[PDB]
């Protein structure tokens, strides 16, 4: 049963809250890049290089 | 092209308020232009500006230029 | 005090970067530099900005060793003890136009023009005042107000009078990405060019907050529920009175 | 090492208070209750009482201070302005 | 017994945070001590990172700051936590005072802790004026030349005690360099009377809000008020972050970006918001031997409150008069605070000389007589005769 698959076993309750987090971290910082620079889209360095190219 | 805040504060000049306030600049600017060929030169201790007149048209102007001025600047 | 010694209060404009997620308009920040060589360096510096900085955020790599190489630099003495000089590099900073301050007084009838590079966070305003005190000279002071030769009227300035003139006039400076240069204009890429050199870090810090401000709105939504799940049987609790028998 | 002075608290078991007799208590366990049945009936009646039978406390206080600051601000106006310079040379003496 | 007890070290953490008996009906107001603890904490630990980039020297002081802003990687984030820490850090020590004085914490037989704290006020008060002087801003000149030369006006010993301080005839190098010194130890003796002040609230316990005694019905620390401790951690923790990245500079003065210049003086000369009140109290007092007096006497007159307050209740919960007076005082602290910042003008200089008046027969004339009132009232109010 799913508690007992998840959470009873302490010696990866530790260790999947430790495992989880560090997935956790390259995906949320893709996530919130890339809706940080769409929001600011024609504005940044990248977007002027592209056409200061003459 | 022309200046763009030259145009919004003439436009703004020639409303019903700014009329108003113009006017009451140019009442003020006289009454130091009879003041000045008296005796009272270094007199008196005393003498009048129109830094309040002018200060209450510019503060009229700037609310009403200021939140439209830069959609016309690229 | 008056209102004439306070000074005039600046009004507040829509700059694209006010608002927790906006970054800066670099096109703005590149044309604000030309601005600045073209007429403020003839007087002002930018002693805590170094070339490097620029690479990436308004020029390319091999712009600024141009620029850079129109300077020149101290260099170490050579083997008798003489001084040398040598161009500039990407680690030199950008030079100001006067050797020290007694030469800089002399040149502007005794005023001190101050460096430009914190001046947006050194005053009260911010940049709707550098914005206001650029195109705000009148054509002539109000009546009354008799100027100390030498000095300029601007009712924004502290007092009224101002010992710099105005500087900005239309068509002035040749843009390369074809903008008009009125005076408007000039004086909104140049204010954006200057929050950059107050401000380096303006981008990178709204993004990490991003981040910041999200994790710590999940723990402390969490916090709540498990606080209130653990205190149930507290909150719930009942309590009987019966008086014991007497004699004892 | 040595024994303590005296105090007003103890510890489990001793904890200093009178002897009790004749209450009983109950309670259920957490994990046999309505999850989160909060938000309603106090956010109805409960957060609302709980102020506004002191409210009056706090804003009568509130408001004598902000009628004294409010009223000495618009007088240090009137006094740098043009037309209270004369009052302004009286008070300055 | 279990290991957490019979272990010699282990013991004081589960006698202080683990087995702890608390007052079962204490509020969130109680949760203030330990955001103080995590407070301190935060100071310190930003304040040795930036101490391994700075230099001390009066030429390189002003540069090594925008050294840290510019250079250093996340310095940005260690000087903006560091200096709006420094904000919080006053905010919730002004809430945790209050509190005291509200439910009576200050009484019989807790008076020793009361004392302890008012100790640690004043050192937190000393620790802040000398991080201020580090950065040599023209803030920071100009400010640390007004409050050392009140002390030349101490009779006899006055104008050797502030050339003493200076190390010179003014504000100058060696002044800057024994101030970055001082700043340096001071949060090391704050923490070393936190200790004390724990080992007195461990003899007695707390209080709770109603007043009475708390030993009918007891909860222990662990998992209850851990967990609620856990609420107000995270909601610091977000305001806090709110201000270091998005308004990074609202409580603070665009001078201080100026470079100290000694021939050079400001339009006006402001403190921080949080040292306001006591500034407009010395601003009060025309003489300025009195003034300085004056202006110590506002944080001693703390200790006068066991002996000034005559009422067999302890708190405010159920009495009316001392209610209304409490939040007299509150916003008579506001109103100082706002009065400091101000110029010297007519007519917020006696607006400031009336609200200094109240501020102390608060303590030594109205607590006195309130409280004999309100123990007749309660009496013939039942009392058939
Ligand atoms: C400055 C940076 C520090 C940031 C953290 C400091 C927090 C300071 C706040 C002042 C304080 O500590 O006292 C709070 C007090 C309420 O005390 P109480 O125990 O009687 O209320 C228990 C509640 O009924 C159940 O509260 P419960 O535990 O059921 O839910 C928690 C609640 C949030 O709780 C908190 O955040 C406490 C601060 O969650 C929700 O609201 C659910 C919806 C999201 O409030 C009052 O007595 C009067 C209310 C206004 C006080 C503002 C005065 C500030 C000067
Ligand atoms: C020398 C040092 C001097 C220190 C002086 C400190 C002054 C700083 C101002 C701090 C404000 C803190 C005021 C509140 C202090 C907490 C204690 C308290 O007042 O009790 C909470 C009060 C009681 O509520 P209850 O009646 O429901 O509970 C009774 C117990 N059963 O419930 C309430 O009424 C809470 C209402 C709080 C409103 C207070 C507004 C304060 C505004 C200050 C703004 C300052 C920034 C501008
Ligand atoms: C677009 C060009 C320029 C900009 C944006 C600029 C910016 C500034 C700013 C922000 C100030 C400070 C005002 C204050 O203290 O509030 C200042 C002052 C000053 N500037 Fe300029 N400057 C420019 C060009 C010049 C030029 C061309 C000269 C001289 C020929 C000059 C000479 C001065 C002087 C003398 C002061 C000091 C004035 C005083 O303190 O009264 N500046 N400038
Ligand atoms: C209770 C602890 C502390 C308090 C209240 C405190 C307060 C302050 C304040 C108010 C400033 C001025 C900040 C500004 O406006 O820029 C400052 C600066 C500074 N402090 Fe602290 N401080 C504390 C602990 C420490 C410690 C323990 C150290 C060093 C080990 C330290 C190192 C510094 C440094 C290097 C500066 C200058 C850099 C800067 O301006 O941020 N601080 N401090
Ligand atoms: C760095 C500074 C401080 C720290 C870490 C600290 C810590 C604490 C803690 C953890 C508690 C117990 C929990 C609570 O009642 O909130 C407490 C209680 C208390 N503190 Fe502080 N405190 C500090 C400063 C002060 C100050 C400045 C004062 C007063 C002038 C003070 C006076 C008291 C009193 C009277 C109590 C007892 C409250 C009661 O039992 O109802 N403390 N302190
Ligand atoms: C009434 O019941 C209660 C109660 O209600 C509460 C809240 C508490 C809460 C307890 C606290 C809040 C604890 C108080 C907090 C402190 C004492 C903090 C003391 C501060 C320090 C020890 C600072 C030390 C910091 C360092 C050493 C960091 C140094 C930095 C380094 C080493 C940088 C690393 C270097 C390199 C080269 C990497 C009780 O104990 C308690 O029981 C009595
Ligand atoms: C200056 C303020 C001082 C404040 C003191 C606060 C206490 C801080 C301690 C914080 C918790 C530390 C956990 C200690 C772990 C258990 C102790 C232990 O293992 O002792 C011993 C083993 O000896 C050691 O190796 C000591 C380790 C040094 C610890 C230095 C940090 C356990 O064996 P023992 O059976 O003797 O334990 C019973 C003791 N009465
Ligand atoms: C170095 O300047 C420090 C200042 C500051 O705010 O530090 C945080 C400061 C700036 C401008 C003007 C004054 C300043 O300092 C101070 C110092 C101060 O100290 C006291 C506070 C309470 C009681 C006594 C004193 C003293 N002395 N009370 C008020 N302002």
Redesign the pocket.
């Known amino acids: 049963s799913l508690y007992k698959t998840f959470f009873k076993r302490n010696a990866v309750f530790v260790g999947t809250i430790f495992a989880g987090a560090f997935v956790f971290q390259t995906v949320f910082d893709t996530a919130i890049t890339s809706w940080y620079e769409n929001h600011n889209k024609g504005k940044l360095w990248k977007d002027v290089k592209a056409r200061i190219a003459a | 092209v022309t200046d763009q805040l030259e145009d919004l504060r003439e436009h703004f000049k020639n409303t019903e308020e700014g009329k108003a306030l113009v006017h009451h600049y140019e009442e003020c600017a006289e009454r130091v232009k009879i003041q000045q060929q008296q005796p009272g030169y270094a007199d008196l201790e005393h003498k009048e500006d129109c830094v309040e007149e002018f200060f209450h048209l510019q503060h009229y102007l700037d609310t009403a230029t200021a939140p439209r001025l830069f959609d016309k600047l690229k | 005090m008056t209102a004439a010694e306070h000074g005039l209060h600046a009004p507040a404009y829509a700059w694209s970067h006010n608002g927790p997620f906006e970054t800066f308009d670099h096109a703005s920040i590149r044309r604000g530099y030309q601005?600045y060589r073209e007429?403020?360096a003839?007087?002002?510096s930018l002693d805590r900005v170094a070339w490097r900085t620029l690479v990436g955020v308004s020029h390319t790599n091999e712009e600024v060793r141009n620029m850079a190489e129109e300077f020149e630099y101290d260099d170490e003495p050579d083997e008798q003890g003489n001084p040398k000089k040598r161009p500039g590099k990407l680690s030199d900073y950008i030079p100001g136009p006067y050797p020290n301050e007694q030469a800089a007084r002399a040149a502007?009838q005794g005023?001190?023009?101050?460096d430009?590079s914190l001046?947006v966070k050194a005053?009260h305003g911010g940049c709707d005042?550098?914005f206001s005190?650029?195109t705000g000279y009148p054509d002539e002071p109000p009546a009354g107000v008799a100027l100390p030769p030498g000095?300029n009227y601007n009712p924004y300035?502290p007092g009224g009078s101002?010992?710099?003139?105005r500087?900005?006039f239309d068509d002035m400076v040749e843009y390369e990405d074809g903008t008009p240069a009125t005076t408007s204009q000039?004086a909104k890429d140049?204010t954006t060019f200057?929050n950059w050199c107050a401000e380096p870090e303006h981008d990178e810090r709204k993004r990490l907050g991003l981040k910041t401000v999200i994790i710590l709105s999940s723990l402390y939504l969490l916090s709540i529920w498990v606080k209130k799940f653990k205190w149930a049987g507290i909150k719930t609790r009942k309590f009987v009175f019966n008086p014991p028998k007497p004699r004892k | 090492g040595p024994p303590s002075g005296k105090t007003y608290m103890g510890w489990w078991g001793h904890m200093g208070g009178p002897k009790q007799k004749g209450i009983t208590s109950y309670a259920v366990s957490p994990y046999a209750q309505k999850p989160l049945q909060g938000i309603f009936h106090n956010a109805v009646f409960n957060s609302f009482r709980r102020f506004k039978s002191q409210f009056l406390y706090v804003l009568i206080p509130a408001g004598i201070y902000w009628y004294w600051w409010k009223n000495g601000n618009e007088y240090n106006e009137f006094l740098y302005s043009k037309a209270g310079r004369e009052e302004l040379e009286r008070v300055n003496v | 017994m279990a290991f957490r007890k019979s272990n010699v070290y282990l013991s004081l953490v589960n006698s202080y945070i683990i087995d702890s008996p608390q007052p079962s009906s204490i509020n969130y107001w109680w949760n203030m001590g330990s955001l103080l603890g995590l407070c301190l904490v935060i100071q310190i630990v930003t304040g040795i990172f930036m101490a391994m980039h700075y230099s001390s020297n009066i030429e390189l002081a002003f540069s090594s700051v925008e050294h840290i802003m510019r250079d250093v990687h996340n310095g940005y984030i260690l000087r903006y936590l560091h200096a709006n820490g420094a904000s919080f850090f006053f905010m919730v020590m002004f809430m945790h005072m209050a509190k005291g004085l509200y439910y009576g914490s200050y009484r019989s037989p807790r008076v020793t802790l009361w004392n302890v704290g008012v100790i640690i006020f004043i050192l937190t008060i000393a620790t802040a004026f000398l991080g201020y002087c580090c950065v040599y801003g023209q803030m920071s000149h100009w400010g640390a030349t007004v409050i050392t030369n009140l002390f030349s006006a101490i009779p006899f010993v006055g104008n050797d005690i502030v050339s003493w301080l200076w190390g010179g005839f003014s504000v100058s190098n060696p002044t800057i360099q024994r101030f970055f010194a001082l700043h340096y130890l001071v949060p090391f003796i704050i923490a070393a009377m936190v200790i004390m002040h724990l080992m007195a609230l461990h003899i007695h316990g707390s209080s709770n809000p109603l007043g009475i005694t708390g030993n009918l019905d007891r909860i222990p620390m662990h998992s209850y008020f851990i967990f609620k401790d856990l609420v107000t951690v995270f909601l610091f923790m977000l305001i806090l972050a709110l201000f270091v990245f998005y308004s990074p500079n609202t409580l603070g003065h665009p001078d201080n970006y100026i470079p100290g210049n000694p021939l050079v003086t400001p339009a006006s000369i402001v403190p921080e918001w949080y040292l306001l009140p006591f500034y407009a109290i010395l601003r009060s007092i025309p003489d300025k031997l009195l003034g300085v007096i004056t202006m110590f006497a506002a944080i001693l007159v703390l200790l006068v409150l066991p002996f000034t307050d005559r009422s067999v209740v302890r708190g405010n919960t159920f009495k009316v008069l001392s209610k209304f007076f409490f939040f007299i005082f509150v916003f008579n602290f506001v109103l100082l605070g706002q009065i400091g910042a101000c110029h010297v003008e007519v007519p917020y200089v006696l607006m400031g000389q009336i609200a200094t008046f109240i501020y102390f027969a608060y303590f030594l004339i109205i607590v006195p007589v309130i409280s004999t009132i309100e123990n007749v009232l309660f009496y013939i109010g039942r009392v058939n005769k």
């Open positions: 601005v007429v403020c003839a007087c002002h502007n005023a001190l023009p101050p430009l001046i005053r005042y550098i005190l650029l000095s300035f101002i010992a710099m003139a500087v900005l000039m140049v200057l």
